[PDB]
Design a protein around this nucleic acid. Structure first.
Ligand SMILES: Nc1ccn([C@@H]2O[C@H](COP(=O)(O)OP(=O)(O)OP(=O)(O)O)C[C@H]2O)c(=O)n1
Ligand SMILES: [Ca+2]
Ligand SMILES: [Ca+2]
Length: 1203
RNA sequence: CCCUACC
RNA sequence: GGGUAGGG
């Protein structure tokens, strides 16, 4: 030590400067006060200027109004915590006040007027802080709005009143209008923006006056929207600000809106990979049940928070050897995840959103400085979020002589901790140095060790989910004959044993009962443990006495509540939340463990708008009760869209839409649009005419017209539509057309397999002399396939993939398709398939029974296009169960070849590229799956597999004639695996063809029979295919020309030319709406019409009942309303800040579900799962419900977003 | 279970 | 009938 302790303290208390900066400026002053205060004052700048190269993207905005003069101010800092800090508040509160009277606008004037004090803080704080901008606004009446501190606006308007200007100010803060009027936009920035779009359009091939008109309409919008005037007013999106003003005899002379940080990079920051980055410099020179603990580090930016967590990691690895960007380290007794808390808001967000909780914080302060002024806000954050314990790591202690000085810093911290109710006197404080720790220096190494010892002993072990009291969120209820009432769900915490009593609590008056049993799909059980999906059997209680959403718990452990206060986060436009703010009476859905429930909120004191993206405390009150205690997470929803997360803080005491309007629409909806002749045709023809193309001569021409594959994209697009649009229409009288042809087709395919079956089992030409491409590919493909697939389908493979889903089986019809009827009604099965069923039956205690054992499937017929139906096959139920098993497994394996059968999106893009690039082809086989013969499978597949495939197929088929077929092909369409099998067969060949040619196999991609490989490969692929029995569809395969198609998307030199189809007689208003919407989506660029089509759209829109002509919804909400602008829908009711619009839906009648079967289906599904930012983990999946379609329509109200 | 869009 | 994506 040099000079004395209490000499430095009073140097701090009158300055706020760092400890060592105080001692060291007290030596060069020979123990003199005033002399010292000066060496620092006179060095205030050396510090500040050292911080210039520190990005200050945070801060506050302030705002003041004087009679009718107003100023808006922005002064940055680099941190959340500094912005809410008292001192920094006072600087900006002052630089603002004294900037009012002294009416300034030149940012430099008031800057330099404060520069000598701007250095005061920057020294005392340790963050770059400085005035960023200022501006001034005056008018006849101006008003301001302050959205916390992140954003303020000043609004000046003539002829307006008090609240009006507030509201306008608030709107401005929400909608960011970059001008005050549509006619105020830089007639240059625009006149040259109209000069860029004109190509985008005229290069797509569009005729002069079309590209123009389009661009004009676009630009008219492009502006109206970025202009206060043509902006849907925020407090009533139905009318815009423009109209709001006009009807108040007012206008807006001008406005300013500032937002903290606007246009300042705000350099990204990754925590983990930075620690490893600081760990790298000294990178140089069983018991799995261990408890899991979350810790957060919190303190001043460069007080060494990052170096400490580096230290904590090396040292811990060196010694005890071994969500979202978070380092993790181990102690001999527990396992840690560690986050940084660089921002206050940002942290509160993650704490609500569950993306990062905290069992204890670690407050980091460098002893060379001591607590900073903003250290208050650090501890305060801890306090506000309820971090249960806070440990202190004094850092950089080695850069300190007097040890009495550390005794002194440590006092300051303890006193701060206690000012915020933390155990100041009893809280751990390790005197350490992270730097030396990383230099291996074992003196300062045992302090890190010591810190982790406190982590192990001061932050108490968190409560293992099993040790808390039983609770199971009820997902569904079943009435099971001779086994009472049963609920299913995942037990959330605790254990339930048979015999114990339970309460069922939530939505109605709480009820009591006792546990009869506990079952999973395979085992029956006497206890259910936390994390397990189960059924639990209750006694005396009935199934209409229990609802989903209730919980099952140990008695008295959980109680039902209706009112509570909470901390919630509203998602932004980004995260898929709302895109408009809400206000006083927000009335959304609060989803709890498994169900939505309506609630109203009240905002805290003095807040009256809420924007996507921000935090808020609100007092929520629910329509009826839900079991809850403190801590319980919940989502916030609007029509099943997630717009917020929440956490109950404290439970409290808890002491639009029109009917005739629905009736009007219902009546209209059940009306018949009726016209003469064929409406579909008339529409197509008015369309052909508006694009100036010759109309369809007759019904005959609709289905026999071929497009010219040339001319401009525009010319081709309507030409392609002409060829496709009527091609699947099912109501053509004119034609002895049929489905007789579908069977001929079907018989042709079989006979084809018969030939190639003969051939492939006979290729003894008895002459090696000759070598063949097809032979070669089969050999190569076989070898690749085995490497991918294995000798045989894994048992686990089957365990996670066999399932029932869907439609008809050989015993169930469309009506009894649902999986719950498959578990209830006995299913048929094949003699060869029997052992699978028995094995499944040996596998569970539930009954598993076989209607009948027979080798037949049912060949039926389903619609395809105007020219032919498609023959498929309805399988035996149990065979299906297992087919989907192997089908599911092949789907997984095929990923290793880059083939992803869940994503037809990758095939569409390669179609599009092949379209400009001509380097890729799209190809198509004719009877794709009807042509895979038995022989081909047998040559390609491992024996183990082919056998399993032979057991599971239907060997025989019963046609509608009662006649039979003994199948030549391996499997028919409608089998559980044929799609995935044809994909693998197709890919394996194309890949082998690639290697034979020295192309990259990886360029191959396949989805069913939509095959995409490199163009040069096609001729050889054609030959292989011909050889192994397939016939390639010359008409729908493209390896040159400007055209490509794959998976629904059609492209022409890069432009989307995918058509649309009218399939049915248009008879109801839903039929017509669907067609019109398809027209809309095909003719609209971003909501703007091609004029050619729009004239036809408007012509036919007049055929609808009047109210249905105006009842519009945004795109992506379905087709029970015309797509258009929902803001101008007269029937849209804005109810509680969420907007509700009526759509047409099919009127259903409820049917009785199969109680046992539904319960198996539920349980079986939970089995399937066990073998398998983000608050999506807050929602489940829903209860079995059956319903008949009556032929009528209903009106349903759905939630919408302005869009 | 009932609608639309595709293989 | 099988699968995909979206909707109730
Ligand atoms: N409604 C459909 C459509 C396709 N697929 C499956 O996807 C593959 C694609 O067959 P398509 O290309 O649609 O037509 P193909 O049966 O091969 O007959 P074609 O091209 O001559 O019309 C084959 C089949 O397994 C299906 O099962 N059911
Ligand atoms: Ca095909
Ligand atoms: Ca195809």
């Amino acid at each position: 030590a040099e000079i004395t302790a209490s000499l430095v303290k009073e140097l701090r208390e009158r300055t706020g400067a760092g400890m060592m900066d105080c001692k060291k400026a007290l030596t060069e002053a020979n123990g003199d006060i005033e002399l010292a205060i000066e060496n620092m004052r006179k060095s205030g700048a050396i510090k500040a200027a050292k911080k210039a190269g520190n990005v200050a993207a945070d801060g506050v905005i302030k705002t003041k109004i004087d009679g009718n003069y107003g100023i808006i101010l922005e002064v940055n800092c680099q941190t959340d915590f500094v912005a809410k800090d008292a001192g920094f508040q006072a600087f900006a509160d002052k630089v603002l006040d004294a900037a009012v009277a002294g009416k300034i606008t030149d940012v430099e004037v008031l800057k330099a007027q404060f520069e000598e004090e701007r250095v005061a803080l920057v020294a005392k704080i340790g963050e770059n802080i400085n005035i960023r901008r200022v501006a001034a606004l005056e008018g006849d009446v101006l008003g301001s709005y302050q959205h916390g501190a992140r954003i303020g606006v000043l609004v000046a308007a003539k002829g307006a009143d008090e609240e009006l200007v507030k509201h306008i100010a608030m709107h401005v803060a929400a909608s960011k209008p970059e001008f005050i009027k549509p006619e105020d936009v830089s007639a240059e920035v625009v006149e040259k923006e109209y000069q860029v779009q004109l190509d985008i359009a005229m290069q797509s091939g569009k005729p002069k006056e079309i590209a123009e008109k389009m661009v004009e309409g676009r630009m008219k919008k492009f502006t109206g929207e970025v202009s206060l005037t043509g902006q849907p007013f925020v407090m009533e999106p139905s009318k815009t600000v423009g109209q709001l003003l006009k009807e108040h005899n007012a206008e807006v002379t001008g406005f300013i809106r500032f937002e903290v940080g606007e246009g300042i990079e705000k350099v990204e920051t990754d925590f983990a990979a930075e620690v490893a980055a600081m760990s790298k410099q000294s990178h140089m020179s069983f018991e799995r049940t261990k408890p899991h603990v979350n810790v957060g580090t919190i303190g001043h930016v460069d007080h060494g928070k990052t170096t400490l967590t580096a230290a904590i990691t090396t040292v811990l690895a060196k010694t005890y050897g071994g969500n979202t960007s978070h380092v993790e380290y181990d102690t001999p007794t527990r396992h840690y995840a560690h986050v940084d808390c660089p921002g206050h808001a940002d942290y509160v967000k993650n704490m609500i959103t569950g993306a990062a909780q905290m069992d204890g914080a670690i407050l980091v302060v460098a002893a060379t400085d001591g607590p900073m002024p903003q250290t208050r806000e650090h501890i305060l954050l801890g306090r506000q979020v309820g971090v249960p314990y806070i440990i202190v790591f004094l850092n950089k202690c080695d850069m300190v002589d007097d040890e009495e000085l550390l005794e002194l810093v440590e006092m300051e911290v303890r006193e701060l901790l206690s000012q915020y109710d933390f155990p100041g006197d009893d809280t751990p404080i390790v005197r350490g140095s992270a730097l030396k720790a990383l230099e291996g220096d074992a003196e300062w190494e045992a302090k890190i060790l010591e810190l982790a010892g406190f982590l192990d002993s001061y932050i108490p072990e968190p409560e293992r989910a099993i040790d808390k009291p039983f609770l199971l969120p009820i997902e569904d209820v079943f009435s099971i004959s001779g086994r009472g009432t049963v609920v299913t769900g995942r037990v959330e915490r605790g254990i339930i044993k048979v015999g114990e009593e339970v309460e069922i609590v939530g939505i109605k008056e709480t009820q009591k009962s006792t546990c009869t049993g506990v079952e999973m799909f395979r085992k029956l059980l006497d206890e259910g443990r936390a994390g397990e999906n189960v059924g639990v059997l209750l006694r005396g209680i009935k199934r209409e006495e229990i609802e989903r959403g209730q919980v099952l718990a140990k008695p008295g452990t959980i109680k039902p509540h209706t009112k509570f206060e909470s901390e919630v986060y509203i998602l932004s436009k980004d995260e898929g939340g709302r895109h408009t703010p809400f206000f006083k009476g927000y009335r959304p859905q609060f989803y709890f463990r498994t169900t939505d429930v309506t609630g109203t909120i009240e905002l805290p004191e003095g807040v009256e708008m809420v924007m996507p993206g921000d935090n808020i405390k609100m007092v929520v009150t629910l329509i009826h009760p839900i079991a809850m205690d403190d801590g319980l997470r919940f989502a916030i929803r609007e029509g099943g869209r997630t717009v917020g997360a929440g956490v109950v803080a404290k439970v409290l005491s808890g002491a639009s839409s029109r009917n005739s309007l629905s009736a009007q629409l219902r009546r209209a909806a059940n009306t018949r649009i009726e016209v003469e002749g064929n409406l579909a045709l008339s529409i197509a023809n008015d369309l052909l005419l508006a694009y100036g193309q010759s109309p369809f001569n007759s019904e005959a021409e609709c289905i026999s017209f071929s497009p010219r594959f040339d001319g401009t994209p525009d010319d081709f697009r309507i030409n392609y539509l002409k060829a496709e649009i009527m091609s699947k229409y099912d109501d053509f009288s004119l034609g002895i057309d049929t489905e007789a042809v579908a069977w001929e087709k079907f018989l042709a395919a079989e006979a084809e397999c018969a030939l190639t079956n003969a051939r492939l089992y006979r290729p003894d030409y008895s002459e090696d002399f000759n070598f063949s491409l097809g032979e070669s590919c089969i050999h190569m493909a076989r070898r690749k396939i085995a490497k991918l697939i294995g000798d045989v389908p894994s048992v686990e493979g089957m365990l996670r993939h066999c399932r029932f889903s869907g439609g008809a089986t050989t015993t169930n019809n469309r009506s009894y398709g649902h999986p719950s009827f498959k578990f209830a009604l006995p299913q048929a099965c094949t003699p060869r398939a029997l052992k699978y069923v028995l094995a499944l039956r040996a596998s569970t205690h539930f009954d598993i029974r076989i209607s009948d054992i027979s080798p037949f499937n049912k060949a039926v017929t389903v619609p395809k296009n105007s020219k032919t139906d498609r023959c498929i096959a309805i399988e035996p139920g149990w065979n299906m169960f297992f087919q989907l098993g192997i089908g599911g497994i092949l789907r997984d394996r095929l990923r290793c070849w880059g083939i992803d059968l869940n994503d037809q999106t990758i095939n569409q893009r390669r179609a599009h590229e092949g379209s400009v690039t001509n380097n890729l082809a799209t190809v198509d086989l004719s009877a794709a799956s009807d042509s895979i013969s038995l022989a081909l499978c047998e040559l390609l597949l491992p024996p183990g597999w082919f056998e399993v495939l032979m057991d599971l197929r239907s060997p025989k088929g019963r046609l509608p004639d009662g006649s039979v077929v003994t199948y030549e092909k391996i499997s028919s369409m409608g089998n559980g695996y044929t799609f995935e099998l044809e994909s693998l067969i197709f890919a394996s060949l194309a890949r082998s063809v690639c290697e034979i040619l020295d192309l990259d196999s990886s360029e191959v991609t396949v989805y069913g029979d939509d095959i995409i490989l490199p163009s040069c490969a096609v001729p050889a692929l054609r030959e292989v295919f011909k050889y192994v029995g397939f016939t390639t569809n010359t008409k729908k395969t493209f390896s040159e020309g400007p055209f490509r198609e794959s998976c629904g998307k059609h492209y022409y030199s890069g432009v989307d030319v995918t058509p649309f189809y009218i399939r049915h007689r248009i008879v109801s208003p839903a039929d017509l709406i669907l067609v019109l919407n398809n027209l809309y989506r095909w003719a609209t660029i971003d909501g703007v019409w091609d004029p050619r089509a729009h004239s036809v759209y408007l012509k036919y829109r007049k055929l609808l009942p009047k109210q249905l002509q105006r009842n519009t919804i945004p795109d992506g909400y379905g087709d029970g309303a015309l797509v258009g602008s929902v803001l101008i829908n007269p029937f849209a009711k804005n109810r509680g800040w969420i907007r509700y619009v009526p759509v047409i839906t099919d009127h259903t009648r409820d049917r009785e579900r199969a109680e046992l079967g539904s319960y198996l289906y539920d349980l079986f599904s939970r089995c399937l799962s066990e073998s398998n930012a983000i608050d999506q983990l807050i929602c489940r999946s829903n209860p079995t419900k059956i319903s008949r379609s009556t032929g009528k329509f209903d009106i349903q109200y759905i939630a919408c977003s302005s869009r």
